Amino acid sequence: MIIVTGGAGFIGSNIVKALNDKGITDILVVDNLKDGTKFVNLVDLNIADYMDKEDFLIQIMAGEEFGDVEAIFHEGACSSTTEWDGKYMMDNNYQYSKELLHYCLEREIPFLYASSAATYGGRTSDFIESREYEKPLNVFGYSKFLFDEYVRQILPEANSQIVGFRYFNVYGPREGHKGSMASVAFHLNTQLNNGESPKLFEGSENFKRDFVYVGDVADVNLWFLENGVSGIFNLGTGRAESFQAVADATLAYHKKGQIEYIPFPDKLKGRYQAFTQADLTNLRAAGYDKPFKTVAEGVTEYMAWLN
Amino acid sequence: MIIVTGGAGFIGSNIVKALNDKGITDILVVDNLKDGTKFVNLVDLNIADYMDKEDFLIQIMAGEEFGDVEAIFHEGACSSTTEWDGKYMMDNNYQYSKELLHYCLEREIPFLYASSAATYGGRTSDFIESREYEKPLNVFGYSKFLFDEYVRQILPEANSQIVGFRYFNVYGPREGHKGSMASVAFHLNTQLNNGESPKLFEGSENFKRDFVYVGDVADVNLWFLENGVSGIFNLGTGRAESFQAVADATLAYHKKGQIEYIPFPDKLKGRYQAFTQADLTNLRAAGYDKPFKTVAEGVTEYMAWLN
Amino acid sequence: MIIVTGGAGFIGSNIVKALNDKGITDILVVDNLKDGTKFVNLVDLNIADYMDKEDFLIQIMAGEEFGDVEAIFHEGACSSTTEWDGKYMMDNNYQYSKELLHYCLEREIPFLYASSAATYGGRTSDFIESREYEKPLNVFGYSKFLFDEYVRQILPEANSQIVGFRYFNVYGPREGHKGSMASVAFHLNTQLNNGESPKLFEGSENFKRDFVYVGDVADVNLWFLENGVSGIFNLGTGRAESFQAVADATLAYHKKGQIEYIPFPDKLKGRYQAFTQADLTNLRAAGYDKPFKTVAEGVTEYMAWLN
Amino acid sequence: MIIVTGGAGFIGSNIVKALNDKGITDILVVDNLKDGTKFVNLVDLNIADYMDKEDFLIQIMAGEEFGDVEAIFHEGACSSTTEWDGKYMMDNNYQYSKELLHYCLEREIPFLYASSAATYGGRTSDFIESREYEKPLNVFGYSKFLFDEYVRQILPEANSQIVGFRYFNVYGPREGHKGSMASVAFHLNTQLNNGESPKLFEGSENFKRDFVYVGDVADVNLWFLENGVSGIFNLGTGRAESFQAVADATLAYHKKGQIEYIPFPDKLKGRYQAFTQADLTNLRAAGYDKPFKTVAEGVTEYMAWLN
Amino acid sequence: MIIVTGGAGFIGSNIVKALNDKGITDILVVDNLKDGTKFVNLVDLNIADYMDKEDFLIQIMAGEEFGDVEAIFHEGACSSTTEWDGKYMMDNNYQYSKELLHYCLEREIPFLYASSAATYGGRTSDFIESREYEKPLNVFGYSKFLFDEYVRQILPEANSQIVGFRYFNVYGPREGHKGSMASVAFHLNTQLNNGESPKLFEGSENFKRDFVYVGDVADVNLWFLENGVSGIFNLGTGRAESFQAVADATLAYHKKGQIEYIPFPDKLKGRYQAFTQADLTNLRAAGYDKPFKTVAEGVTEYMAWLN
Ligand SMILES: NC(=O)c1ccc[n+]([C@@H]2O[C@H](COP(=O)([O-])OP(=O)(O)OC[C@H]3O[C@@H](n4cnc5c(N)ncnc54)[C@H](OP(=O)(O)O)[C@@H]3O)[C@@H](O)[C@H]2O)c1
Ligand SMILES: NC(=O)c1ccc[n+]([C@@H]2O[C@H](COP(=O)([O-])OP(=O)(O)OC[C@H]3O[C@@H](n4cnc5c(N)ncnc54)[C@H](OP(=O)(O)O)[C@@H]3O)[C@@H](O)[C@H]2O)c1
Ligand SMILES: NC(=O)c1ccc[n+]([C@@H]2O[C@H](COP(=O)([O-])OP(=O)(O)OC[C@H]3O[C@@H](n4cnc5c(N)ncnc54)[C@H](OP(=O)(O)O)[C@@H]3O)[C@@H](O)[C@H]2O)c1
Ligand SMILES: NC(=O)c1ccc[n+]([C@@H]2O[C@H](COP(=O)([O-])OP(=O)(O)OC[C@H]3O[C@@H](n4cnc5c(N)ncnc54)[C@H](OP(=O)(O)O)[C@@H]3O)[C@@H](O)[C@H]2O)c1
Ligand SMILES: NC(=O)c1ccc[n+]([C@@H]2O[C@H](COP(=O)([O-])OP(=O)(O)OC[C@H]3O[C@@H](n4cnc5c(N)ncnc54)[C@H](OP(=O)(O)O)[C@@H]3O)[C@@H](O)[C@H]2O)c1
Ligand SMILES: [N]C1=N[C]=NC2=C1N=[C]N2[C]1O[C]([C]OP([O])(=O)OP([O])([O])=O[C]2O[C]([C][O])[C]([O])[C]([O])[C]2[O])[C]([O])[C]1[O]
Ligand SMILES: [N]C1=N[C]=NC2=C1N=[C]N2[C]1O[C]([C]OP([O])(=O)OP([O])([O])=O[C]2O[C]([C][O])[C]([O])[C]([O])[C]2[O])[C]([O])[C]1[O]
Ligand SMILES: [N]C1=N[C]=NC2=C1N=[C]N2[C]1O[C]([C]OP([O])(=O)OP([O])([O])=O[C]2O[C]([C][O])[C]([O])[C]([O])[C]2[O])[C]([O])[C]1[O]
Ligand SMILES: [N]C1=N[C]=NC2=C1N=[C]N2[C]1O[C]([C]OP([O])(=O)OP([O])([O])=O[C]2O[C]([C][O])[C]([O])[C]([O])[C]2[O])[C]([O])[C]1[O]
Ligand SMILES: Nc1ncnc2c1ncn2[C@@H]1O[C@H](COP(=O)(O)OP(=O)(O)O)[C@@H](O)[C@H]1O
Numbered sequence A, B, C, D, E: 001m002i003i004v005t006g007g008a009g010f011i012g013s014n015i016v017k018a019l020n021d022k023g024i025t026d027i028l029v030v031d032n033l034k035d036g037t038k039f040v041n042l043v044d045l046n047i048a049d050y051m052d053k054e055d056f057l058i059q060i061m062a063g064e065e066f067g068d069v070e071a072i073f074h075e076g077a078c079s080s081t082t083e084w085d086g087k088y089m090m091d092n093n094y095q096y097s098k099e100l101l102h103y104c105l106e107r108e109i110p111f112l113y114a115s116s117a118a119t120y121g122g123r124t125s126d127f128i129e130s131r132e133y134e135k136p137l138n139v140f141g142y143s144k145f146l147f148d149e150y151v152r153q154i155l156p157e158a159n160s161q162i163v164g165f166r167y168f169n170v171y172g173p174r175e176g177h178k179g180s181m182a183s184v185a186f187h188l189n190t191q192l193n194n195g196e197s198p199k200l201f202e203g204s205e206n207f208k209r210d211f212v213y214v215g216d217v218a219d220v221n222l223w224f225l226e227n228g229v230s231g232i233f234n235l236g237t238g239r240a241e242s243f244q245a246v247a248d249a250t251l252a253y254h255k256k257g258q259i260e261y262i263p264f265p266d267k268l269k270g271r272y273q274a275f276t277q278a279d280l281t282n283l284r285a286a287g288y289d290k291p292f293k294t295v296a297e298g299v300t301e302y303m304a305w306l307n
Helices: A010-021 A036-043 A053-062 A086-107 A139-157 A176-181 A184-193 A214-227 A243-254 A281-285 A295-305 B010-021 B036-043 B053-062 B086-107 B139-157 B176-181 B184-193 B214-227 B243-254 B281-285 B295-305 C010-021 C036-043 C053-062 C086-107 C139-157 C176-181 C184-193 C214-227 C243-254 C281-285 C295-305 D010-021 D036-043 D053-062 D086-107 D139-157 D176-181 D184-193 D214-227 D243-254 D281-285 D295-305 E010-021 E036-043 E053-062 E086-107 E139-157 E176-181 E184-193 E214-227 E243-254 E281-285 E295-305
Strands: A002-005 A027-031 A049-052 A071-074 A111-114 A162-167 A169-171 A199-201 A211-213 A231-235 A260-262 B002-005 B027-031 B049-052 B071-074 B111-114 B162-167 B169-171 B199-201 B211-213 B231-235 B260-262 C002-005 C027-031 C049-052 C071-074 C111-114 C162-167 C169-171 C199-201 C211-213 C231-235 C260-262 D002-005 D027-031 D049-052 D071-074 D111-114 D162-167 D169-171 D199-201 D211-213 D231-235 D260-262 E002-005 E027-031 E049-052 E071-074 E111-114 E162-167 E169-171 E199-201 E211-213 E231-235 E260-262
Touching (some): A027 A053, A036 A176, A071 A086, A086 A111, A111 A214, A139 A231, A184 A199, A184 A295, B002 B010, B010 B027, B010 B214, B049 B053, B053 B086, B111 B214, B169 B214, B184 B243, B184 B295, B199 B243, B243 B295, C010 C027, C036 D086, C049 D086, C111 C214, C139 C162, C162 C214, C169 C295, C184 C243, C243 C295, D036 D176, D071 D086, D086 D139, D111 D139, D111 D214, D162 D214, D169 D295, D184 D199, D211 D214, D211 D295, D243 D295, E086 E162, E111 E139, E184 E199, E184 E243, E211 E214, E214 E295, E243 E295
Parallel strands (some): A002 A071, A027 A049, A162 A231, A199 A260, B027 B049, B111 B162, B169 B211, B199 B260, C002 C027, C002 C071, C071 C111, D002 D071, D027 D049, D111 D162, D169 D211, D199 D260, E002 E027, E002 E071, E111 E162, E162 E231
């Protein structure tokens, strides 16, 4: 049996699918299905059971057994970078994670969780998995950062696998529910299907991210499960590409449309990463040697799936 | 003693009536009577006691005894296909059901519950009670689907009856409270009694459902109780009929009126089943061999009862 | 010691007064004094103590002793016929009553409670205390009906007094707080003192009720306490009188005014009793043989007290 | 150690000051400081500790010790005569008081509490501390009345001091927070300092009250503590004076202004005491023989303190 | 291990930084991160863990251990002088503090907490740490005052360090979140960077405060920890300077701008301190002999850090 928190969300559901593809269906999904439209992400998948995040937490803290648990993929989190309720953020992200971590540690259950490249918080190089390089620009980022710091305290003493994946800009199938937190690829696709103009922020000529395909993210997750290695690892392609590149791949698929520039949103000024590029040294050194899909490859594959 | 959850609702109250007709009155109804107008559905019936769904759940989970329970007909659920609070849906439908199921299993109490053909989610044939054919279009459907999947895990090991009825489009007496979730028959009748025009969705020429009379649904329920067979079974006539057919039967009774087409509601686009027809192979194979009332028969009988 | 629930309400306060008149002042009143203006109903009376309905219930269910309890007059209920929250109605009326009943039963405390002729729900004769004749038109009525049904299950086995009084149209002193649930007598009086026209519903020419004076209701209550007889008994004059009769008695006292007809309120259409007349066969057979004040007598006595 | 509930309120804070003046500072104040502006009433005083009314109650009911308690002055209450939530009133005034009383009784702690002349409810003479003369005109008054009645049941059996002070119209320093429940003296003063006209109700020519200075009220309280006598005692000057008299004393101090008559407020019609005058027979008979400051004396002393 | 409550706030975060500078990183921060923007204050620091104030309190009161606690710096409080909810203020400031104090006392954990010069409440000299000189002008001040009074009762009997720092007008890095409670220095800086005019209250010519640099405040805190001395001590420079002086230092750095006078805000009239100057006699006598940065020094250092 495997547990996937955030299992009805974007990355989580993709981990579920990947597990299904390996013939594993004995999965417990933990999520918050308040936004019911998220069911789409599970409808075509095969799981054993579903539990709400709040119930799960209660049971975790009471020390309930869930049977023979092989791993927890902890993808569940408040994922909005524009959420400013720190109380909620620190409870739901940081505290929640701590609580899970301890539960796993005590039962020697492999624990594989989601960090974020938001922890790097705006810099132009050296995106390296170490405290010196970390300085989040928002409370979301802070909640992730502090957890990584917590994990770092625990690692030397741990008797079972602990892995944190520092995801960069993930995109692909099963993020339709993320609204304004959905990938630019997604937004452009839906704008184009609506006969609207595809929109980019003002200054996106100079904005670059490490855009990584969700399929690859899933593969990395399973690989680490199979291999047992511990640590905190960047997860991206290693190549930074401009938003313009993403737009290109998208318009190319749709055979139409032309980019329009909207004002840079006030609520992100000072909170924004203008450049990210994953340094994959540690990742490779851990033994994960598979290549990553480029924006051209990933976006077109995604576009096909969206239509 | 028999327990009927959703007992003040449409199908539940009809099960109560059917039990009354067999001389059984030692019934506990579990429901949520917040909408007080639902009392009409019980007023002319004979029951032993009434309990709110929330109290019932608490007692179930505490392992209270209710006396000598012969069966639970679990018809209680949030039945709105346009309810999008997934948290509520999964608690009140899925979790609730699990909780009941376990309670019954442990005491070897026959458990007969409501599934839904919404689990098939829009396809043009092969409405067969098996996972390959299931793909709900909304979270309501998902909550039903996942429970059936759960039941499927339990069945091989079960020591007492477990039956799920996959109801198609049920209509007849005691659904007045269902508002916009009430049968089209019901809506047309009340429109006509109000001197308004009888209304159908745009494109209903091509929309067909397996419309099944509530009386038959009740009979099936009791039959299964008496016969002890387990499984998940489609419950419909086996014949798909157009909404136009329903309208015909109705206008014929009222001796007046002409169909008006209203816009297809935005909130259902992408969430809608355009065709359903129950495959009754498993149902028949279980031994239930009685015929089902056609739309012509059922609707006219209903119309008489409404007036 | 005697307990009167609804003790600050109309009928309850009158039971208190009646007890006072017999030299009994060791009374605990249970009510919900949220509407503070209800204090008037107790101000001139003599009681031992006051408790809120919610606290009372908690203590009842915990099995607290209140000292040496001689009887509970259970007049407390949500008494509005236009309240449509069934959840609340069934908790506060039905469940609450059950809870009291059991408490009394276990301690062999005489339990005398309020039913309602609303249980008959609109019929033109045979207002007899038996299930065949009962069919309430609203959820208030349902909550009363179901409790009577519950009492009926308990009666054959009971070792102490259980009595339910099925009050018809009660009127008299101490109902000023009941707003639109107050007697027509009351409304007419206040309309006339305000220089307004006295108002009756459209079609009141054909509306008749068994109007019974509150003083008589109180007497019946005490009589049953003294005599120990069990059962469910109609409580009204046995004579149906038109609303016109009530108006006559009232205008006669005030020496002025002329009836005006207002529209029949939408919220009561289909929910309304057009005729009631208590069949006093069981009541008389139990041994209560005293006469009841007519509308002419009762209304004029009331009018004097109001001025 | 001494406890003063309502200690941050008008009368309570004055009791604190009086205790300070006798060299006693080991005081626990219990209040509800939601309206923070009430802190002024304590700022210049000396107390040992502060507790919220809700916490206090919890601890009382749990039977916590507070150390060596010498007395409780129970001045805490919802003091608004225009508050019509009876549920709250009866909990916070009546029930709360009962709870304290029992706590004290059990530990033989002298209990000195606040009643009110509102219990007399509008009469033109015989303001005597006995049930025949009591008939409050509002639920505030009722809550006080019923408690006095409760105390009366307890008194013959009590082994420690119980005293209730039936305050008439108290005025003086430390009532600035009472808003529209503040003394007329206070209102006139603030109207005059605002260059507005000093306002009296229409018909105040014929309205008289027993206006008593807060300083005297405090003295009475301490006297009873020192002397140990039990009972319920009127506390006022024994002389009724018109509102006009109060106005006179006030305008005289301010050397300006002329009375304006505003409409008698709707919300008080039928709820209003037109005359009060304390009968001090019992008070004197208990041994308290000190004189009371007249309106002329009291108001001018107050006016000086206000400026 | 060290605990810093209010650790994400202004003074608290500076204590954290100071601890970091001494090589201490084993810190638990307790705060309320509801306003997420406060994360900035911790982002560049090194702590062991984070806990919400409400959870912390629960655990404190349950008597949980946090490991080997060396000290608690209790800087956490509702710090707004214009918050008028006294209930909240007394719970969150006074009660909370008491609760911590007892926890520490019992485990002999050095307890170092924040008082306030607001306790002096407007006077023109003798700002001495003694009750005669204390008279707060608002409920915030009251909550601090009462706690100091409480500490004073405890001190003679205490077996471990208790220190309260009566901070005057603190200013410097990490107060950006304090909005209108932020230093005038801060406000002027942000006004100037916005091309607006730097604003001072009307009458600031005659307003002087003891402005003290946050760096010094931090030093004092650590010094007391190292030295073990107990008591309540003023913490300011000992020199009063006008707001004009602060403005001067600021405009001098920015090389531009001219002071504009805005109306004195209504909500502060009667609640305002016009003059403060710390008397450092006790502070020096305790042994703390280091000098304090003047407004000229402090403000310019701050201005550099802000830019
Ligand atoms: N998407 C990216 O590009 C990316 C990049 C870097 C990091 N990440 C991180 O990776 C994880 C997955 O991201 P995502 O894109 O899949 O986000 P997502 O689509 O929103 O998936 C997360 C789901 O988990 C729920 N959730 C929140 N807190 C939970 C908890 N404590 N336990 C269980 N479920 C919880 C969310 O709902 P509610 O918040 O409404 O309760 C949501 O349904 C998140 O931690 C995210 O921060 C993602
Ligand atoms: N009528 C159809 O065409 C049809 C078709 C397929 C399936 N079904 C299913 O068969 C059952 C009967 O449906 P229906 O048409 O009779 O709907 P319904 O009239 O609304 O009956 C359900 C009643 O039970 C209540 N309820 C909800 N959750 C409950 C719970 N956990 N325990 C007990 N009662 C609960 C509902 O109120 P609240 O949610 O507001 O609390 C309602 O009063 C439902 O499960 C429904 O999904 C019906
Ligand atoms: N007067 C009539 O024409 C007549 C006729 C037939 C039957 N009855 C019945 O006689 C009883 C009293 O009637 P009434 O006219 O005297 O009504 P009433 O004036 O409204 O008095 C009832 C009082 O009891 C309170 N209450 C509600 N639930 C309670 C509970 N569980 N325990 C204790 N008190 C509770 C009510 O407040 P809240 O509900 O707001 O909390 C109200 O203050 C009711 O059951 C009523 O249905 C009266
Ligand atoms: N001064 C008069 O004219 C006068 C005349 C006759 C009788 N009295 C009585 O004398 C007492 C004090 O009167 P006052 O004029 O000083 O009124 P006050 O200034 O309003 O004093 C009462 C204070 O106690 C608080 N409180 C309420 N319930 C409490 C409780 N259960 N325990 C502790 N504190 C509580 C009140 O706030 P909240 O209600 O907002 O919670 C308020 O702060 C009251 O019982 C009053 O009814 C006064
Ligand atoms: N800054 C000055 O010139 C000066 C002057 C006078 C007094 N002080 C005192 O110094 C202390 C801190 O000052 P500051 O300038 O750093 O103010 P601050 O920035 O507001 O720091 C206090 C922080 O702690 C939080 N908090 C509130 N109650 C808490 C509790 N019980 N436990 C833990 N955290 C809590 C506050 O949030 P929430 O209130 O929203 O919950 C806030 O984030 C306060 O006690 C303050 O009164 C400083
Ligand atoms: N440039 C541009 N253009 C257009 N659009 C856009 C851009 N950018 C961005 N965008 C959008 O918005 C949003 C926000 O952004 P940000 O702030 O940057 O965030 P991001 O990163 O991008 O995303 C996020 O992330 C995170 C982590 O990292 C996660 O968790 C989440 O979920 C998300 O993904 C965005 O979203 C877009 O749409
Ligand atoms: N075509 C047409 N026309 C008209 N009308 C209509 C149509 N369709 C539909 N409709 C209406 O609306 C509503 C909704 O529907 P739906 O979404 O589709 O749903 P249904 O299926 O129909 O019904 C339902 O079902 C279910 C299952 O199956 C149940 O549960 C519920 O309750 C219901 O019944 C309807 O209702 C109509 O009215
Ligand atoms: N005819 C006429 N006119 C005028 N007014 C009136 C009439 N009728 C009636 N009314 C009024 O409204 C109300 C209501 O109605 P119902 O629903 O029917 O109610 P009833 O029965 O009469 O009364 C009631 O009752 C009950 C039981 O039986 C109780 O619980 C309640 O509380 C009441 O009493 C009436 O009220 C009148 O005012
Ligand atoms: N005459 C006159 N003029 C003017 N103003 C007035 C008068 N009277 C009165 N006022 C006013 O209003 C108020 C209230 O009144 P009442 O309702 O009457 O009340 P009193 O008695 O006066 O006072 C009260 O008391 C009580 C006890 O008894 C207490 O608790 C409260 O708090 C109060 O004090 C008055 O105040 C004035 O302003
Ligand atoms: N003379 C002044 N000129 C401009 N702003 C002021 C002045 N005095 C106070 N303020 C602003 O108003 C706020 C509140 O002041 P006050 O209530 O005296 O608290 P404090 O003593 O903490 O400054 C301060 O944080 C500051 O931003």
